[PDB]
Design a protein around this ligand. Structure first.
Ligand SMILES: NC(=O)c1ccc[n+]([C@@H]2O[C@H](COP(=O)([O-])OP(=O)(O)OC[C@H]3O[C@@H](n4cnc5c(N)ncnc54)[C@H](O)[C@@H]3O)[C@@H](O)[C@H]2O)c1
Ligand SMILES: NC(=O)c1ccc[n+]([C@@H]2O[C@H](COP(=O)([O-])OP(=O)(O)OC[C@H]3O[C@@H](n4cnc5c(N)ncnc54)[C@H](O)[C@@H]3O)[C@@H](O)[C@H]2O)c1
Ligand SMILES: [Zn+2]
Ligand SMILES: [Zn+2]
Ligand SMILES: [Zn+2]
Ligand SMILES: [Zn+2]
Lengths: 378, 378
């Protein structure tokens, strides 16, 4: 009977970079003002988690509970919370939507800064402390989500309330990769019917770009990956031509320009590699081509190109969560999934349990793997 | 009457890089199919001319008649030419508008390909020879215009027909820097009323961006220049705040972010320096800020930034001629000038003659000089 009480539950704790997560019992404090305590039923993992786990993220902060892609059920809410209540089905999101800041009220972006000063340093806004502990010492939150746990506490501005019949072992992916890819196409680029598109990197994000392009009515949807086995899988997501840059001595941008008689209308970089980001811009058609950076580069890395590439009409842009407003639009994407208008299930290549989370980290180095989903009950 | 005849007239010839131009009598042959022979009355000089003159082009062609900003009076036309005729007042343009090629049919007439195989190597399409010679030896065309001459011959798709009452010693500017600046605002960026703008470089182009932005209804129009005495004339064009980067220890981008509590809505680089291009991007506001590189720089260098600047909502663009279609829209700009809706006179700080053209090249380093206009009659 949990309202207002500390909850003791299982969670995967990362104590040190690049070592195995240990599954412990942890204490989850109750939600203060503006906060929501969530029973997490299913959580996926992705490169973003492993980046921090690996020690490579200069923002990383150990020990922490990682995880940002999940779906669950609200256990309780703190004072003032009105948009969700106990028993609501929810997707916690790493990107907030407070609806009250200069960014939210602007109408020109989805990038809300309301809680980022707490969440970027693994704590809560209300008291600037953590809600997680083991043996009475604090464990940092991660991305404002911390979903590698049976229970988490998040800010109310980061909770999307969803269709209560949607399957929670599928819609956990609607918190990260899938909306990023779809939205890079529909919101950031605004791809028109008949456009030709190049997609660099055919993982989950690239594949969501491909589905978003197919749905928007693109013609040629050219996939580029250094692993040729990715093409067969990518076909069902709408990729219809494939190039492996290893199969050519010329730089990949030149190859794509020759293949398309001038370059593509839109390109999307879905890797996080600055050299490939430059190639993606340079394979765009002059006059009107646009390149959207979706990949997240490591610290200190820079993109470059020649000014003439922009002067002759190419446009360079990028996307954060596909340009979607998380609380307002994640529930819309869940609706679309329930109506069979967007794919989600096809991206889930493995199902494990939270107990087996280190095995899921190994699975990240398998080229076949797109998303792993974890059942947190074991 | 000179129609059908070779004309002999004064021109300034560049025999090789870096030497003084030679004010010679040259022979200008009559126009062939699709060509127009123009009596040039006034011509200005800009950096683009100096770039080739100084040898700073991989391989310019010498000897040549430089010059691309001019106005005059058609002397005769070749076979097939219908849009202009003898006695028409005209502005020859380095940007063609053929209306018939793949680029023109999409709208991007600034990529028109009709005559560039000839103009790019200093000759005419009809016979792949030049129309200029001295003592029987060929002198190459430049930028398809060659305006440092009493008479020139250009392709009809490069000729704008203008209001015959407009002053030729003023509208000679409306073929290059002024449209590029105005058009960077109105066409490339599409600046909205109330926008905050930063403009890097307050020469002719930056002043044209300022006026564009003023006319478009911008609020803060912040000019940045290393020469503080550029601000005085800038205020007449609409600049209403000024920063000299030399007055600050922090890089300029940070100073502009601090001045505007986050960044401007639009920035414009009007210099051609890749490190200022980066600063112009990095001083744009998170979420929506857009930076335009204004004009072909010919720097031969790379622009760089961290891809986070684009992931978090900044957009990078550029423009060659402000998005304007030369033949259709240069005459519209002349009408706007005639109706006092844009300035042209205030750019002209110096008046010399074609005889004195080498003194005009000296002025290109003069802080005080914006455009110098040359009267070709002596
Ligand atoms: N902008 C955002 O909001 C946002 C949100 C989520 C994820 N991401 C980013 O998107 C990226 C993709 O994540 P994912 O889960 O699909 O990753 P993933 O690892 O499943 O896929 C990466 C793909 O890129 C391919 N690849 C690697 N190097 C390559 C190269 N040089 N040329 C061509 N292909 C290459 C791999 O073979 C793999 O198929 C990551 O950078 C991640 O940070 C961004
Ligand atoms: N295609 C070419 O060959 C070529 C070469 C160079 C420049 N250009 C074009 O020249 C155009 C500008 O022409 P203009 O006639 O206005 O030039 P201009 O020389 O009259 O003006 C340039 C202004 O920038 C200022 N400036 C220089 N360095 C600076 C810095 N680091 N920070 C801030 N201010 C600085 C100078 O003081 C000057 O006022 C640009 O559009 C550029 O694209 C073309
Ligand atoms: Zn993720
Ligand atoms: Zn907000
Ligand atoms: Zn010029
Ligand atoms: Zn054309």
């Amino acid at each position: 009977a949990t309202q207002g009480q500390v909850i003791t539950c299982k969670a995967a704790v990362a104590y040190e970079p690049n070592k195995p997560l240990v599954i412990e019992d942890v204490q989850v404090a109750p939600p203060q003002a503006g906060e929501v305590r969530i029973k997490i039923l299913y959580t996926a993992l992705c490169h973003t988690d492993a980046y921090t786990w690996s020690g490579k993220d200069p923002e990383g902060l150990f020990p922490c509970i990682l995880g940002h892609e999940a779906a669950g059920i609200v256990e309780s809410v703190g004072e003032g919370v009105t948009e969700v209540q106990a028993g609501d089905h929810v997707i916690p999101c790493y990107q907030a939507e407070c609806r009250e800041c200069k960014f939210c009220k602007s109408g020109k972006t989805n990038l809300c800064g309301k809680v980022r000063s707490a969440t970027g340093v693994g704590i809560m806004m209300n008291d600037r402390k953590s809600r997680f502990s083991v043996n009475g010492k604090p464990i940092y939150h991660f991305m404002g989500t911390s979903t590698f746990s049976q229970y988490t506490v998040v800010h109310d501005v980061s909770v999307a309330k969803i269709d209560p019949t949607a399957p929670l072992d599928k819609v956990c992916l609607l918190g990260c990769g899938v909306p990023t890819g779809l939205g890079a196409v529909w919101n950031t680029a605004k791809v028109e019917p008949g456009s030709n598109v190049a997609i660099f990197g055919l993982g989950t994000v690239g594949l969501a770009v491909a589905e978003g392009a197919k749905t928007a009515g693109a013609s040629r949807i050219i996939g580029i990956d250094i692993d040729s086995k990715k093409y067969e899988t990518a076909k069902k997501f709408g990729v219809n031509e494939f190039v492996n840059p290893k199969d050519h001595d010329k730089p990949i941008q030149e190859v794509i320009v020759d293949l398309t008689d001038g370059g593509v209308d839109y390109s999307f970089e879905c890797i996080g590699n600055v050299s490939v980001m430059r190639a993606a811009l340079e394979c765009c058609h002059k006059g009107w081509g646009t390149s959207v950076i979706v990949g997240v580069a490591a610290s200190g890395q820079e993109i470059s190109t020649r000014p003439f590439q922009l002067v002759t009409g190419r446009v360079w842009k990028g996307t954060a969560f596909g340009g979607f407003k998380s609380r307002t639009q994640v529930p819309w994407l869940v609706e679309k999934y329930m109506n069979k208008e967007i794919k989600v299930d096809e991206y889930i290549t493995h199902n494990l349990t939270l107990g087996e989370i280190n095995k899921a980290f190994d699975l990240l180095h398998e080229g076949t793997c797109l998303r792993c989903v974890l059942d947190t009950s074991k």
